[PDB]
Amino acid sequence: GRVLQPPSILYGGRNKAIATPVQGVWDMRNKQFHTGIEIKVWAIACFAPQRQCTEVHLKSFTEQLRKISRDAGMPIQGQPCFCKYAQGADSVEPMFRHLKNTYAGLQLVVVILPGKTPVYAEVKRVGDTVLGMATQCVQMKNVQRTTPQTLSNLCLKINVKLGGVNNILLPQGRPPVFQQPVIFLGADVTHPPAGDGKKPSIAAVVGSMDAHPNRYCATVRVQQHRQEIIQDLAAMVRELLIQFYKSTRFKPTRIIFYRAGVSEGQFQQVLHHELLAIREACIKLEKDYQPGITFIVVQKRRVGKSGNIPAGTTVDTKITHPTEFDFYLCSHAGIQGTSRPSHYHVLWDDNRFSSDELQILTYQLCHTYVRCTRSVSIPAPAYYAHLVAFRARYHLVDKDHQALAKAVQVHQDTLRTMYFA
RNA sequence: UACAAGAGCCUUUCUGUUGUU
RNA sequence: AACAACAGAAAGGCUCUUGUU
Ligand SMILES: [Mg+2]
């Protein structure tokens, strides 16, 4: 159970501070964002009732959020140009298309949601596919009784939804594989509630762009009922590779794959299909174009108040397969309950990797998750695959067959935007 | 709908065993 | 083999309560 050193997280701003995570979580005090966005225009969308969420309390939340953000290196310049109340899921598309066609260069819409409602599903469906926006929805309990960590997490998600980098790793502390170009992919499938013959399954992959890996793009399609494999995975990887070359202008050499949402009992069939699928992904672009292929499937399955595993523990043997390159990583502290050391499986190893380098890469990727200043259980790309699969699940909702992947196809503006996080 | 948990609940289902014929 | 009801695991469904410096 080797606890790897957490990455000395590189922040920016006037100080260029470096955050060292202590016990798996680092504070955001006196740390400006590395690539923070000067937020030109932003919007406030209240769906909570005015009885239980007042204008003065919303303005207090806006002011204190702006203070936390200015301390965070992501400045919001002035009061929001849009601050409207609303209600109902059916009143989302007209209001969103009203706010798009009023403020040019619109960046972020903050949406206030009283708990669980179809308003979240319609808000995400309008923002990510129909119109092409970036939104940040938060509950009512976090806009009157707010904490510094709540506003910090809000600012963390807002900074990454708007094209910037919250925090790079150390370029001197990054693993040596970044000496050559790399791309990191993450895949996940969402199945509907069973007995739904008309509701299909969702296959979603995401891919990293830059050599300072904090930016991802998505590609999602719709597949048949209860299918744990992707048919057109090769087209997904090819489109992601094209987008890599288009947005970064340097030729990739390595390929990493982080498969998620796959049952344990039938790993061999999924391996057999998707490995060959990534192979025809590589050989259907140019002759002799072979990157180093590796396939890692990851499956979400003292210290602190709860007394749990410190964030960063790596297990390489004694519970693992001898010949197969599989290992466990527990990279999240136990806030309440127990922490679950994640399982990681690599059979395709032509990417030729040392072990310790590979769990260092996955641990720094876990730290690269942008929605919290703490390491998370499974890496950032497979998280973003999970949230984009759940996002397409919110996209395929009411308020065909497999010709409904026009409803899970992301807009052109948002196809670059890290909207799922 | 920040992160990490826990349980019960009834629907097709993955590993199969037992069983009147 | 199928057979109504099964023992669980794993993936996928809810719902809540357990807190941050
Ligand atoms: Mg999943």
Coordinates of C-alpha atoms (C1' of nucleotides) and ligand atoms in Angstrom, one line a residue:
Chain A
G1 CA 0.0 0.0 0.0
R2 CA 2.4 2.7 -1.2
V3 CA 1.1 6.2 -0.7
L4 CA 2.5 8.1 -3.7
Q5 CA 3.6 11.7 -3.3
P6 CA 0.7 14.1 -4.3
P7 CA 1.6 16.4 -7.1
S8 CA 2.8 19.8 -6.1
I9 CA -0.2 21.4 -7.8
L10 CA 0.9 24.5 -9.8
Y11 CA -1.3 27.5 -9.3
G12 CA -0.8 30.9 -11.0
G13 CA -1.7 34.5 -10.8
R14 CA 0.5 37.2 -9.4
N15 CA 2.2 34.8 -7.0
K16 CA 2.4 31.5 -9.0
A17 CA 1.7 29.7 -5.8
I18 CA 2.2 25.9 -5.5
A19 CA -0.3 23.9 -3.4
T20 CA 0.9 20.8 -1.6
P21 CA -2.0 18.6 -0.7
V22 CA -2.0 17.6 3.0
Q23 CA -3.9 14.3 3.8
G24 CA -5.3 14.3 0.2
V25 CA -7.1 17.7 0.3
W26 CA -5.4 21.1 -0.3
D27 CA -7.0 24.5 0.6
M28 CA -7.5 27.3 -1.9
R29 CA -6.4 30.0 0.5
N30 CA -4.0 32.5 -1.1
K31 CA -3.9 30.6 -4.4
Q32 CA -4.9 32.3 -7.7
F33 CA -6.0 30.1 -10.6
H34 CA -3.3 29.1 -13.1
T35 CA -5.2 30.1 -16.2
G36 CA -8.1 32.0 -14.8
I37 CA -10.7 33.6 -17.0
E38 CA -11.7 37.2 -16.6
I39 CA -15.4 36.5 -16.6
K40 CA -16.8 39.1 -19.0
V41 CA -20.6 38.2 -18.6
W42 CA -22.4 35.7 -16.4
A43 CA -26.0 34.9 -15.6
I44 CA -28.1 34.1 -12.5
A45 CA -31.0 31.7 -13.1
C46 CA -33.3 31.2 -10.1
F47 CA -35.8 28.3 -10.3
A48 CA -36.4 28.2 -6.5
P49 CA -39.4 30.1 -5.2
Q50 CA -39.0 33.7 -4.1
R51 CA -40.4 32.8 -0.7
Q52 CA -37.5 30.5 0.0
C53 CA -34.8 32.4 -1.9
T54 CA -34.9 36.2 -1.8
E55 CA -33.2 38.7 -4.0
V56 CA -31.1 40.2 -1.2
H57 CA -29.8 36.8 -0.1
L58 CA -29.0 36.0 -3.8
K59 CA -27.1 39.3 -4.1
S60 CA -25.2 38.4 -0.9
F61 CA -24.3 35.0 -2.4
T62 CA -23.3 36.8 -5.6
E63 CA -21.0 39.2 -3.7
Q64 CA -19.4 36.6 -1.5
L65 CA -18.9 34.3 -4.4
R66 CA -17.3 37.1 -6.3
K67 CA -15.0 37.8 -3.4
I68 CA -14.0 34.1 -3.2
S69 CA -13.4 34.1 -7.0
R70 CA -11.3 37.2 -6.9
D71 CA -9.2 35.6 -4.2
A72 CA -9.2 32.5 -6.5
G73 CA -7.6 34.3 -9.5
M74 CA -10.8 34.1 -11.6
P75 CA -12.2 37.6 -11.6
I76 CA -15.8 38.4 -12.2
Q77 CA -16.0 42.0 -13.5
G78 CA -19.0 43.5 -11.8
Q79 CA -22.6 42.5 -11.3
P80 CA -24.1 39.9 -13.6
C81 CA -25.9 41.3 -16.7
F82 CA -28.6 38.6 -16.3
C83 CA -30.4 37.8 -13.1
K84 CA -33.8 36.3 -13.6
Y85 CA -36.3 34.1 -11.8
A86 CA -38.0 31.2 -13.6
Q87 CA -39.9 28.0 -12.9
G88 CA -40.7 24.7 -14.7
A89 CA -38.6 22.6 -17.0
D90 CA -40.6 23.7 -20.1
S91 CA -39.5 27.3 -19.5
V92 CA -35.8 26.6 -20.1
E93 CA -35.2 26.6 -23.9
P94 CA -36.9 30.0 -24.5
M95 CA -35.2 31.6 -21.5
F96 CA -31.8 30.2 -22.5
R97 CA -32.2 31.3 -26.1
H98 CA -33.3 34.7 -24.8
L99 CA -30.1 35.0 -22.7
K100 CA -27.9 33.8 -25.6
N101 CA -29.3 36.4 -28.0
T102 CA -29.0 39.3 -25.5
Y103 CA -25.4 39.2 -24.3
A104 CA -22.7 38.6 -26.9
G105 CA -19.8 36.4 -25.8
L106 CA -21.9 34.8 -23.0
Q107 CA -19.8 32.4 -20.9
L108 CA -21.5 31.1 -17.8
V109 CA -25.1 30.8 -16.5
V110 CA -25.5 30.1 -12.8
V111 CA -28.8 28.2 -12.3
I112 CA -30.4 27.8 -8.9
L113 CA -32.3 24.6 -8.4
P114 CA -34.6 23.7 -5.4
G115 CA -33.4 20.1 -5.0
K116 CA -34.2 17.4 -7.6
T117 CA -36.4 18.4 -10.5
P118 CA -36.7 17.8 -14.3
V119 CA -35.5 21.4 -14.6
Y120 CA -31.9 20.2 -14.3
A121 CA -32.4 17.7 -17.1
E122 CA -33.9 20.3 -19.5
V123 CA -31.3 22.9 -18.5
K124 CA -28.4 20.6 -19.3
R125 CA -30.1 19.4 -22.5
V126 CA -30.6 23.0 -23.8
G127 CA -27.1 24.1 -22.7
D128 CA -25.0 21.3 -24.0
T129 CA -26.7 20.1 -27.2
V130 CA -29.5 22.5 -28.4
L131 CA -27.8 25.9 -27.9
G132 CA -24.2 25.3 -26.9
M133 CA -23.7 27.0 -23.5
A134 CA -21.9 26.3 -20.3
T135 CA -24.0 26.2 -17.1
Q136 CA -23.4 25.8 -13.4
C137 CA -26.4 24.6 -11.4
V138 CA -26.4 24.6 -7.6
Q139 CA -29.0 23.8 -5.0
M140 CA -31.0 26.2 -2.8
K141 CA -29.3 25.2 0.5
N142 CA -25.9 26.5 -0.8
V143 CA -27.2 30.0 -1.7
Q144 CA -28.3 31.1 1.7
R145 CA -26.2 29.0 4.1
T146 CA -22.9 29.1 2.2
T147 CA -19.4 27.9 3.2
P148 CA -16.0 28.9 1.9
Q149 CA -15.5 25.4 0.6
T150 CA -18.9 25.6 -1.2
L151 CA -17.9 28.8 -3.0
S152 CA -14.4 27.4 -3.7
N153 CA -16.0 24.3 -5.4
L154 CA -18.3 26.6 -7.4
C155 CA -15.4 28.7 -8.6
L156 CA -13.4 25.5 -9.4
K157 CA -16.2 24.2 -11.6
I158 CA -16.8 27.6 -13.2
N159 CA -13.2 28.1 -14.1
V160 CA -13.0 24.7 -15.9
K161 CA -16.3 25.1 -17.7
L162 CA -15.0 28.3 -19.4
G163 CA -12.0 27.1 -21.2
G164 CA -9.3 27.8 -18.7
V165 CA -7.0 25.7 -16.5
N166 CA -7.7 25.6 -12.8
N167 CA -4.3 24.0 -12.0
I168 CA -1.6 22.2 -14.0
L169 CA 0.6 19.6 -12.5
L170 CA 4.3 20.3 -12.1
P171 CA 6.0 20.2 -15.5
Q172 CA 9.1 19.2 -13.7
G173 CA 7.1 16.8 -11.6
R174 CA 5.0 15.2 -14.4
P175 CA 5.8 11.6 -15.4
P176 CA 8.4 11.3 -18.2
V177 CA 5.7 10.0 -20.7
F178 CA 4.8 13.7 -21.3
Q179 CA 8.3 14.1 -23.0
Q180 CA 6.5 12.6 -26.0
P181 CA 2.9 13.6 -27.1
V182 CA 0.1 11.8 -25.2
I183 CA -3.7 11.7 -25.4
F184 CA -5.9 10.4 -22.6
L185 CA -9.3 8.9 -23.4
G186 CA -12.1 7.9 -21.1
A187 CA -15.1 5.8 -22.0
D188 CA -18.3 4.9 -20.2
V189 CA -21.8 3.5 -21.0
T190 CA -25.0 4.4 -19.4
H191 CA -27.8 1.8 -19.4
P192 CA -31.4 2.8 -18.8
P193 CA -33.8 1.3 -16.2
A194 CA -34.5 -2.2 -17.3
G195 CA -37.7 -3.2 -18.9
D196 CA -37.4 -0.1 -21.2
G197 CA -37.4 -1.6 -24.7
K198 CA -37.5 1.9 -26.3
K199 CA -34.9 3.6 -24.0
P200 CA -31.4 2.9 -25.4
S201 CA -27.9 2.8 -24.0
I202 CA -25.3 5.6 -24.2
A203 CA -21.7 5.3 -25.2
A204 CA -19.5 8.3 -24.3
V205 CA -15.8 9.0 -24.6
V206 CA -13.6 12.0 -23.8
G207 CA -10.1 12.9 -24.9
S208 CA -7.4 15.2 -23.6
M209 CA -5.8 17.9 -25.8
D210 CA -2.8 19.7 -24.3
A211 CA 0.5 18.5 -22.9
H212 CA -0.5 20.2 -19.6
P213 CA -3.6 17.9 -19.4
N214 CA -6.6 19.8 -18.1
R215 CA -8.8 20.2 -21.2
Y216 CA -11.0 17.5 -22.7
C217 CA -13.4 17.0 -25.6
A218 CA -16.3 14.6 -25.8
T219 CA -17.9 12.3 -28.4
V220 CA -21.1 10.4 -27.5
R221 CA -23.3 8.0 -29.5
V222 CA -26.4 5.9 -28.8
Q223 CA -26.4 2.1 -28.9
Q224 CA -28.9 -0.7 -28.4
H225 CA -30.5 -1.9 -25.2
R226 CA -28.2 -3.2 -22.5
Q227 CA -25.1 -3.4 -24.6
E228 CA -21.8 -3.2 -22.7
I229 CA -19.6 -2.6 -25.8
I230 CA -19.3 0.3 -28.3
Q231 CA -19.7 -0.5 -32.0
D232 CA -18.3 2.8 -33.4
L233 CA -15.5 3.3 -30.9
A234 CA -13.0 3.6 -33.8
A235 CA -14.9 6.6 -35.2
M236 CA -15.0 8.2 -31.8
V237 CA -11.3 7.8 -31.3
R238 CA -10.6 9.0 -34.9
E239 CA -12.7 12.2 -34.3
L240 CA -11.0 12.8 -31.0
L241 CA -7.6 12.4 -32.7
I242 CA -8.6 14.9 -35.4
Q243 CA -9.8 17.3 -32.8
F244 CA -6.5 16.8 -31.0
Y245 CA -4.5 17.7 -34.1
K246 CA -6.8 20.6 -34.9
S247 CA -6.8 22.3 -31.5
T248 CA -3.2 21.5 -30.5
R249 CA -1.2 21.5 -33.8
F250 CA 1.3 18.7 -32.8
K251 CA 1.2 15.1 -33.7
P252 CA 0.3 12.6 -31.0
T253 CA 2.4 9.5 -30.3
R254 CA 0.9 7.8 -27.2
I255 CA -2.7 6.7 -26.6
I256 CA -4.2 5.9 -23.1
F257 CA -7.7 4.5 -22.6
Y258 CA -9.7 4.6 -19.4
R259 CA -12.8 2.4 -19.9
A260 CA -15.6 2.6 -17.3
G261 CA -19.0 1.2 -16.5
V262 CA -18.3 -2.4 -17.5
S263 CA -19.5 -5.5 -15.6
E264 CA -16.8 -7.7 -13.9
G265 CA -18.1 -11.0 -15.1
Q266 CA -17.7 -10.3 -18.9
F267 CA -14.5 -8.3 -19.0
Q268 CA -12.9 -10.6 -21.6
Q269 CA -15.5 -10.0 -24.3
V270 CA -15.4 -6.2 -23.8
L271 CA -11.6 -6.3 -23.8
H272 CA -11.7 -8.4 -27.0
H273 CA -14.0 -6.1 -28.8
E274 CA -12.8 -2.7 -27.6
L275 CA -9.0 -3.5 -27.9
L276 CA -9.5 -4.4 -31.6
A277 CA -11.8 -1.4 -31.9
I278 CA -9.0 1.0 -30.8
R279 CA -6.7 -0.9 -33.1
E280 CA -8.9 -0.2 -36.2
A281 CA -9.1 3.3 -34.7
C282 CA -5.4 3.6 -35.1
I283 CA -5.1 1.9 -38.5
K284 CA -8.0 3.7 -40.3
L285 CA -6.3 7.1 -40.4
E286 CA -2.9 6.5 -42.1
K287 CA -0.7 3.6 -43.0
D288 CA 1.9 2.6 -40.4
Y289 CA 0.3 5.0 -37.9
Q290 CA 0.6 2.9 -34.7
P291 CA 0.7 4.8 -31.4
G292 CA 1.5 2.9 -28.2
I293 CA -1.8 1.3 -27.2
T294 CA -2.8 0.7 -23.6
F295 CA -6.3 -0.2 -22.3
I296 CA -7.1 0.4 -18.7
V297 CA -10.6 -0.3 -17.4
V298 CA -11.2 1.2 -14.0
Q299 CA -14.1 0.3 -11.6
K300 CA -15.0 2.3 -8.5
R301 CA -14.9 -0.8 -6.2
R302 CA -5.4 6.6 11.2
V303 CA -6.2 9.5 8.9
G304 CA -9.0 12.1 9.4
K305 CA -12.1 12.2 11.5
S306 CA -13.5 9.0 10.0
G307 CA -10.2 7.1 10.3
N308 CA -9.7 5.9 6.7
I309 CA -7.1 5.3 4.0
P310 CA -5.1 8.5 3.1
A311 CA -5.6 9.7 -0.4
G312 CA -2.9 8.3 -2.7
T313 CA -2.5 4.7 -1.6
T314 CA -1.3 2.4 -4.4
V315 CA -1.6 -1.4 -4.3
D316 CA 0.3 -3.4 -7.0
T317 CA 0.3 -7.0 -5.6
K318 CA -1.2 -9.3 -3.0
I319 CA -4.8 -8.8 -4.3
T320 CA -3.9 -8.5 -8.0
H321 CA -3.4 -10.8 -11.0
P322 CA 0.2 -11.9 -11.5
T323 CA 0.4 -11.9 -15.3
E324 CA -2.3 -9.3 -16.1
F325 CA -1.2 -5.7 -15.4
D326 CA -3.9 -4.8 -12.9
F327 CA -3.7 -2.7 -9.7
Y328 CA -5.7 -0.7 -7.1
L329 CA -5.5 3.0 -6.3
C330 CA -7.3 4.5 -3.3
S331 CA -6.9 8.2 -4.0
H332 CA -9.6 9.9 -1.9
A333 CA -9.7 10.4 1.8
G334 CA -12.6 9.1 3.9
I335 CA -14.8 12.1 4.6
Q336 CA -17.6 10.0 6.2
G337 CA -17.7 6.2 6.0
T338 CA -15.0 4.3 4.2
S339 CA -12.8 5.0 1.1
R340 CA -13.0 2.5 -1.9
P341 CA -9.6 1.6 -3.4
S342 CA -10.4 1.5 -7.2
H343 CA -9.5 -1.4 -9.5
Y344 CA -7.6 -0.8 -12.7
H345 CA -7.0 -3.4 -15.4
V346 CA -4.4 -3.4 -18.2
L347 CA -3.9 -6.3 -20.6
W348 CA -3.0 -4.4 -23.7
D349 CA 0.5 -3.1 -22.8
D350 CA 2.1 -2.3 -26.1
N351 CA 2.3 1.2 -24.7
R352 CA 5.1 -0.3 -22.7
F353 CA 4.7 1.1 -19.2
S354 CA 6.5 0.8 -16.0
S355 CA 4.1 0.1 -13.1
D356 CA 5.1 2.9 -10.7
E357 CA 5.0 5.4 -13.6
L358 CA 1.5 4.2 -14.5
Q359 CA -0.1 4.6 -11.0
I360 CA 1.8 7.9 -10.8
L361 CA 0.1 9.0 -14.0
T362 CA -3.3 7.8 -12.8
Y363 CA -2.9 9.5 -9.4
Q364 CA -1.9 12.8 -10.9
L365 CA -4.9 12.4 -13.2
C366 CA -7.1 11.9 -10.1
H367 CA -5.6 15.1 -8.7
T368 CA -6.3 16.7 -12.1
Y369 CA -10.1 16.5 -11.4
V370 CA -11.3 20.1 -11.4
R371 CA -14.5 20.1 -9.4
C372 CA -12.8 19.8 -6.0
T373 CA -9.4 20.6 -4.4
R374 CA -8.8 17.0 -3.5
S375 CA -7.8 13.8 -5.2
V376 CA -10.8 11.6 -6.3
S377 CA -11.2 7.9 -6.6
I378 CA -10.9 7.2 -10.3
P379 CA -9.0 9.4 -12.8
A380 CA -10.2 12.7 -14.3
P381 CA -10.9 11.4 -17.9
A382 CA -13.0 8.4 -16.7
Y383 CA -14.8 10.8 -14.4
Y384 CA -15.6 13.1 -17.3
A385 CA -16.7 10.1 -19.3
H386 CA -19.1 9.2 -16.5
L387 CA -20.5 12.8 -16.2
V388 CA -20.9 13.1 -20.0
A389 CA -22.7 9.7 -20.1
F390 CA -25.0 11.0 -17.3
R391 CA -25.2 14.3 -19.2
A392 CA -26.4 12.4 -22.3
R393 CA -28.8 10.5 -20.1
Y394 CA -30.2 13.9 -19.1
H395 CA -30.2 14.8 -22.8
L396 CA -32.3 11.8 -23.7
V397 CA -35.3 12.8 -21.8
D398 CA -38.9 13.8 -22.6
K399 CA -40.0 17.3 -21.5
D400 CA -36.1 6.6 -32.8
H401 CA -34.5 3.2 -32.1
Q402 CA -30.9 4.2 -32.3
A403 CA -31.5 7.2 -34.5
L404 CA -31.7 9.3 -31.4
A405 CA -28.0 10.1 -31.4
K406 CA -28.9 13.4 -32.8
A407 CA -30.3 14.2 -29.4
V408 CA -27.0 13.1 -27.7
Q409 CA -24.8 15.0 -30.2
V410 CA -23.1 18.0 -28.6
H411 CA -23.1 21.5 -30.1
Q412 CA -20.1 22.7 -32.2
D413 CA -19.2 25.4 -29.6
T414 CA -19.5 22.9 -26.7
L415 CA -17.6 20.2 -28.5
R416 CA -14.5 22.0 -27.5
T417 CA -15.9 23.0 -24.1
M418 CA -15.3 20.9 -20.9
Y419 CA -19.0 21.1 -20.1
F420 CA -19.4 17.7 -18.5
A421 CA -17.3 18.7 -15.5
Chain B
rU1 C1' -27.5 19.7 -8.8
rA2 C1' -19.2 20.3 -5.1
rC3 C1' -17.0 15.3 -2.6
rA4 C1' -17.7 10.6 0.1
rA5 C1' -21.0 7.4 2.3
rG6 C1' -24.8 4.2 4.1
rA7 C1' -29.6 1.2 3.9
rG8 C1' -34.3 -0.6 2.7
rC9 C1' -37.5 -1.1 -1.5
rC10 C1' -40.1 -4.1 -5.8
rU11 C1' -39.1 -4.8 -11.5
rU12 C1' -36.0 -8.0 -16.8
rU13 C1' -31.3 -9.3 -15.6
rC14 C1' -24.8 -12.0 -14.2
rU15 C1' -22.4 -16.8 -11.3
rG16 C1' -24.8 -21.0 -10.9
rU17 C1' -26.8 -25.0 -7.3
rU18 C1' -30.9 -27.7 -5.6
rG19 C1' -36.0 -29.9 -7.2
rU20 C1' -41.8 -33.2 -8.1
rU21 C1' -41.9 -34.9 -13.1
Chain C
rA1 C1' -32.5 -27.2 -21.4
rA2 C1' -36.9 -24.5 -20.3
rC3 C1' -40.0 -24.2 -15.6
rA4 C1' -42.5 -19.6 -10.6
rA5 C1' -39.7 -18.3 -6.8
rC6 C1' -34.8 -18.4 -5.5
rA7 C1' -28.4 -17.4 -3.0
rG8 C1' -25.5 -13.7 -3.7
rA9 C1' -21.3 -10.5 -6.9
rA10 C1' -20.7 -7.0 -10.5
rA11 C1' -22.7 -3.5 -13.4
rG12 C1' -26.8 -0.3 -14.3
rG13 C1' -32.9 2.6 -10.4
rC14 C1' -34.6 5.5 -6.9
rU15 C1' -34.9 7.6 -2.0
rC16 C1' -33.0 9.7 2.1
rU17 C1' -29.9 10.6 6.3
rU18 C1' -24.3 10.7 8.2
rG19 C1' -20.3 16.5 7.5
rU20 C1' -16.5 20.1 5.9
rU21 C1' -11.7 24.8 9.0
Ligands
MG1 MG -20.6 4.7 -14.7

